[model samples]
Target: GSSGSSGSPNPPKLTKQMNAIIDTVINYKDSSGRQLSEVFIQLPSRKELPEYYELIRKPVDFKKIKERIRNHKYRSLGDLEKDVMLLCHNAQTFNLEGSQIYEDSIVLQSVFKSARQSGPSSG
Candidate 1:
């Protein structure tokens, strides 16, 4: 049986298999020579990663960030993700009654994993 009234709800569950894929992405070095996993790990722990799946799944809107950089000299991808994740948490917090952000995090996760393993797609 589940535990007694814990105030808020629990976080989402990630398959153990997915952890391996995350490990792979973590190994790659970004353009500035940083590891994806390191950046991901640095995301602040809220709900102590019970909702980690949703946190990772949150929309990063890289295209929007790129546009801002090109059109307005936004000047830095360095903290873009950190900023975005904070906003994402704010948005989701208001929208849920202590539940996961969405089921689609799985789809996004798979895409990221596959793209890294397979290289660029052909036209």
Candidate 2:
């Protein structure tokens, strides 16, 4: 007797959708032609912003999220969303409301939402 419990650990469509969303975000440019995602691709430098680490308990970025997607680390779409939201939240928290980075976070949030809304739904 043999037990056959193998199942698809990662959904191909989900990964593809996530990657597409990331690509859209990273390539997004503001009216002045500034790629906002470039500012969020990685964590802030501790030397440059020493207070950031103290303020943000957990820092997430687009590059890290992409790596997680490729590594099959996200268990569900919600997991990926959480990280993306966290990335935006961290920027908002670190930067003042009127600052460029803060405004960029707002734009990024909108972009993420729009992408998710248009993406293939599991339901």
Candidate 3:
């Protein structure tokens, strides 16, 4: 949701994380091994997800979650990754938790972790 502005050097990290979550949510592949691009194929965009759409319908929620997670000082990357995975899983479906979400969340969490540690910004 938040793009990298010239005013902020690390804002791209947020964009990446946000994109990671959405990418995981819409990664539906058919039996033919071909990929379906939800962004281009879907008419209304939100049609891909119906039940859990409320969680991500508003873009502000993504930025708000990133800011909140950025401020939280996780004891380890493992902890942060777990939390991010839970957040992503819970947003889409209650029972259908995917590996891509966890993997991307872990990677994004690490990026945020390093950025938070090195940057001067106070969350």
Candidate 4:
């Protein structure tokens, strides 16, 4: 008996979902009217802030995250989330408790969480 195979053919949609969430997080502005994404778009210069590298063992940023997404470096949403957290954590670690960057990281963390909640589901 010949039957038409109707099983769900899964496609790789994780990248799109992850990118959408990242875009949401990056475009958010904090209370000071600063786009937090711009703050973390790239790595701090070692010449300007030598201590950053010493404090942050693994640095991550929006630019690097976008590159990783395009390169298919993330296997799952969890992996991408880890990198996002790393970026935020790096900011918190290097900046003073009351500093602008540290406060921005906190806001970015919450924004990322809300974005993920609205993100696409596997089901």
Candidate 5:
């Protein structure tokens, strides 16, 4: 018999691994020769709120981003993701694509997400 523990729901720690080829990118050094990981870790924890998964914005440094996420138990996992991506830059070049402020004046995009069912026919 499975016993329910607490009122707060926290799923078992088993993040589903994805199987897909992605074009990953990252800048190793800053203008002053500061490592990206250092900057991420040193960042002060700001707000604490939860957001939907669809709002996530992926940065170039997948590994560092992952580490920063794991290190800081963020209130809003999705929002924190978007915030971290904005911090990255390639020397003087700031990676600004796919990054725009969420404004009340702007038109919102309808993003769709689907999960594959685990079955014999599923691929």
Candidate 6:
């Protein structure tokens, strides 16, 4: 959620990660010869926000999540936290992906494992 854009040239790696997931799921198909459903779809642009997504019985075109980040203003950490928390509160629809959210949080925690546990780097 922080985006870590303080001085880095990149916007944020997680955005790219989320975008990749969205892109893949959107185009993903099934072995039964039917198209895969694209849940948690992101809108295309601001103008299309009103009818961005529709509950479809069939597969739909892939929509990139990155467009939301690019179109809307950058959100603060608080905003992201609230949105994620709210979703998790009713994550019955997400099943495994919901668990993945927790998994990612754990990985993020590991990033701080060495920093506080050990003394500052000699180099």
TM agreement with the true structure for every prediction: 0.28, 0.82, 0.29, 0.79, 0.24, 0.29
1-123 per-residue lDDT for model 2 (tens digits): 934342555788778888777677677677688688888877768899888888898887777898888777777788888888998998888889989889988998888878876655667
Q: lDDT per prediction? A: 0.39, 0.80, 0.42, 0.80, 0.30, 0.36
Give model 2 RMSD, 1 decimal.
5.5
Q: Which 10 consecutive residues of model 6 have the lowest summed lDDT? A: 56-65
- Global Cα RMSD, each model: 17.7, 5.5, 11.1, 8.0, 12.6, 11.4
Model 4 lDDT tens row, 8-123: 43236766778778888988886677576787887878899888788788876789888877776666688788899999998888888989788889988898889977766656
Worst 10 residues of 4 by lDDT: 2-11
Model 5, backbone clash pairs (residues 3+ apart or across chains), number? 0
What local lDDT score does residue 81 receive in model 6, on the 0 to 100 scale? 35
Give the Cα error of residue 20 in candidate 3, in Å: 17
10 residues in a row with least lDDT, candidate 5: 104-113
Put down candidate 6 lDDT per residue, 1-123, tens digits, no spaces: 545443432356544443444344334443365442323343244356433224222222223223444544334333333433333232333235537444433333243233223323245
lDDT of 1 by residue, 5-82 (tens): 434332222222223333344444543763333333434445665565464555344344334433433233323435
Which number leads on TM-score? Answer: 2
Q: What lDDT tens digits, residue by residue, belong to model 5 across residues 27-122?
A: 333337643343333322224422311233332334454554444433333443354334343211332344332220011111101111221234
Superposed model 3: Cα runs more than 4 Å off: 1-44, 54-98, 119-123
Model 1 poorest 10 in a row by lDDT: 9-18
Candidate 3 per-residue lDDT over residues 10-79, each given as its tens digit: 3555555543443443343432654433222222235665544565433223333445445543333344
Number of clashes recorded per candidate: 0, 0, 0, 0, 0, 0
